[PDB]
Design an enzyme around this catalytic site. Sequence first.
Site: not given
Ligand code: MG
Ligand code: ZN
Ligand code: ZN
Lengths: 446, 446
Positions: B99, B324
């Site tokens: 990320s 996520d």
């Molecule tokens: Mg994030």
């Molecule tokens: Zn991510």
């Molecule tokens: Zn992720």
Amino acid sequence: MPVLENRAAQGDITAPGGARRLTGDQTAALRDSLSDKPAKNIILLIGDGMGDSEITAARNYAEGAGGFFKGIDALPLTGQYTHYALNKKTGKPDYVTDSAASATAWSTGVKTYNGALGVDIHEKDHPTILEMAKAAGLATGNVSTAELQDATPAALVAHVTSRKCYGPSATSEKCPGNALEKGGKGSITEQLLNARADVTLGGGAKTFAETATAGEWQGKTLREQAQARGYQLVSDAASLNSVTEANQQKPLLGLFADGNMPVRWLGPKATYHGNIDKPAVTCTPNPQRNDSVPTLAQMTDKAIELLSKNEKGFFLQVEGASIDKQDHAANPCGQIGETVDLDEAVQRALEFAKKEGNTLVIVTADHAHASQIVAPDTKAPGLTQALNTKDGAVMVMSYGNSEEDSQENTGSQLRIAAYGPHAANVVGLTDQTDLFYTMKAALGLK
Amino acid sequence: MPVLENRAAQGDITAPGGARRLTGDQTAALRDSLSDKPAKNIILLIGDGMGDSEITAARNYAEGAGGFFKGIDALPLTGQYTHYALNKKTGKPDYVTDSAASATAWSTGVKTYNGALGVDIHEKDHPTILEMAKAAGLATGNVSTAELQDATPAALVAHVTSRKCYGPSATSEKCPGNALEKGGKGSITEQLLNARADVTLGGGAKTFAETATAGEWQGKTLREQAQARGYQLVSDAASLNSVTEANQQKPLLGLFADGNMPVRWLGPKATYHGNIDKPAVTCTPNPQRNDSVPTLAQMTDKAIELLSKNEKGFFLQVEGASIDKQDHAANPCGQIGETVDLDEAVQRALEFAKKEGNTLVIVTADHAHASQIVAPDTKAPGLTQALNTKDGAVMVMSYGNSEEDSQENTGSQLRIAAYGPHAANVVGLTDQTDLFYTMKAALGLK
Ligand SMILES: [Mg+2]
Ligand SMILES: [Zn+2]
Ligand SMILES: [Zn+2]
Ligand SMILES: [Mg+2]
Ligand SMILES: [Zn+2]
Ligand SMILES: [Zn+2]
């Protein structure tokens, strides 16, 4: 109407702005891509199992991450579409479709149950976009690298309660109600012969060996029946190129393999912990692919040349069939090679459409598949493989959705892209059945 | 400029044309969606890990297969973008980003290595879109349901060699070159306090308890430093609503949880053969979600109210963070509930943008994730769970890419959608770094 000429990384990917695919504002180019004028022709390219994951993996390997497929990625209007099927019994959605139900959806506009071809959940037939084009006087072509009895090409010309009803034998047993001798319309192959598209090219010669159990050609093989009904059969590149005309009087039928045509690239199967326990793979061209076997791009080009002689216009469906099959086989190289193969066909189609001017080209898949691109150091439960890409780096692929021999389909929505009049209809979220309506309306069929 | 009001199946899904999402030709509506005029504001919504698979799964469960997310699916211009990272050592592509590297890409326009925030592979700092908007006199906001030190919101205001450098202690050890006491810019939290966005809302109150090791507020907690620098701190929905002004003089900082804010729904974790050995799951709202805790739609709405008072315009980034996280936890209900949560925030953003008329709204994800929608009878090697959907049918979900505790990110290209002036730039294939350039230009920044 512009096709995206170059969306590759503009420069040094490690520097600011180096990985950009755009060089300026797209508003005006997009305005120039919009037209609601009628489509004279339609070329529909389907990569079986070609979800966004398959397109990315293939691009990373063959062109590098910042690369660009000149065919597949050049379509300017893009969207995402849903392809869920229905539970036959309850009529409720079945979230993961098979290739039969999905093909029926864009070819007829009605959702159906997994395994059905050209019939709804009630087993009622519905006309396909090819039957419709033909009735309106357009030339029609059905091209694929799989057996012609396979779900994707068959859906255009057959209506049976089970995709397994390839020829007379299988039908009498699996689709008794469709069995010719039981008064039905016949097996997939018999119906294919009846439909009479002007150009049909693909594999599946094998089933043509069966003999009809009833009817006018009772006793003859389906091969005999075809010649008898006036079809021109061809079986190799050379003969294919020899063809100059293809019509209702002398429709063309090319059978280039007993089963599915040969795959472009070879490589080993993915294995448990294969990215850890085994060296990275470089795919290798298949020595059997052959100079005698037309490629998908060649079959596409011939089909366009012949169908193009019809002043009314034409409908052509081209299928990059073994993407799905290699994906099911957990074979990266076979899978990537078939996507690259499809790209070449898309290029041919786009080159013609660009110059012709009234051709709607659409590139999409019937459903998503199993393959996922994971980190190199991944310790996964399934089958994995490390590959050496064009970037000179390693990409790992994971097939983790089945303990059985073959990896299954998945239900994510996936890319659909188009170019030409009426392509705006693939932008945003749409359903696979809207594709049938979009094509019927662009061509102005009834 | 029209938003897609309804793209749900128009009728009986079992009947011809019943599953269509379109009711007519879209050309004209798409022509009306095209504008190169300048954008006065920009609202960027990120669903962490929300790839096309995550959107389909959440739509099937919450709205039914033929359903429609009034926010997420309503954006008319859609495309697919690539988000590969770079290998720090070689500079070659690293096909699966984390990320931090992805957020740095859209926020600075330069690719970087996994784990970096606001710096390139040479560890050089590059100004972010937020720092730039602020410098030009626009209001700015950073909203997220995760800890504010997490990669997505942090990338907008911090430049550190490792995303793990949350506060003073981690930094001194992990990012010694950034440690305040070693002459660096400071930890993620200290840099966040220096960037001084007008509105920052999220979790991560915990790290604010650390004390600075050097500088002017040496000895004070970061919480004390905030108050001393004149930030208005709020910790609950009520105080948040009490806020009437947020600016450089009195910037707002809402800390609503020690760590990540609470998930919306609860449900058990996926398990080996869970779709076989266990009954279908129905998600349930989380009792702890609370009337005292603002929802993502609430935080978005308050942020728009406050930032809207700046005549120059604003830049706001809103993150649905636990999609996520729940995906990594192999927890379907937590994953879907956060997607539904994000849709609500997209609805408020679109409502404002639709009436304001010069707001560009973009909805996308930083990278793809693990979850795949598979057949109900699937016997998979990983973790699976059967869910009862709104359609009254069962959907099975598989996490099959890791034998470790957490499921990993994947590298497919994925949907990006937009509405407003300059939205055309997200159509077709683009790169995540193009998004930085699209936003910079739309806003007319230098
Ligand atoms: Mg994030
Ligand atoms: Zn991510
Ligand atoms: Zn992720
Ligand atoms: Mg097929
Ligand atoms: Zn298929
Ligand atoms: Zn398939």
